[PDB]
Amino acid sequence: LEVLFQGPVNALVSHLLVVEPEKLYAMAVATLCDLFDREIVVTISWAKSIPGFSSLSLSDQMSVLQSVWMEVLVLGVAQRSLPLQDELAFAEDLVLDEEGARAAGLGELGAALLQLVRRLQALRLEREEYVLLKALALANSDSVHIEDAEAVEQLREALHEALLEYEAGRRRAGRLLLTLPLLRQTAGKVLAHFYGVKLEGKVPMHKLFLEMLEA
């Protein structure tokens, strides 16, 4: 997989499009908990198909994922919601307006999520740009538990370079990067809400989802 950093970027970009996870169905706070648990599984194998990722030590792979997983989930909801208006596509069969989202026990999260969505709508994000950006957010982790900082930085750099190379086929990359602060704040809001749900103890949550909330 690392050879995708050495050739032309179109090969890298097509690889990222091919390993995009397929549409998920959800089958109403317990619905999202179930759906988010399953998207963590999907996200883990997605990460493994990102060139460079599997060359990190396992414990650093762990640290990255447990600090960015919600950023990747939230960015997926955002790309799926880009063509819609005041609605959030959590799944193929779970589209929700702001009112619909209060009712599924999300409080103000719908508003937070739509703020991200509007910011990406303003950019007219392409599908190619999204998968490079998603990979780049993975690699921009900032976990306190990272051991080989230099290795994570090196992977970050290649993905950033890939975005630059892609955009040159020229202020556009930076515009993309300037939506990352909002992506990370939004993800942290989603996290705080579901950590609150953990404490209530009403809604049952699967092992993996609990483990990632603890981290």
């Binding site: 599984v41 994922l65 447990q66 092992k207 993996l208 990632m212």
Partner: peptide, 9 residues
């Protein structure tokens, strides 16, 4: 740990 199991699959 659950995470370790899916990573090392």
């Amino acid at each position: 740990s659950e995470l370790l199991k899916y990573l090392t699959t």
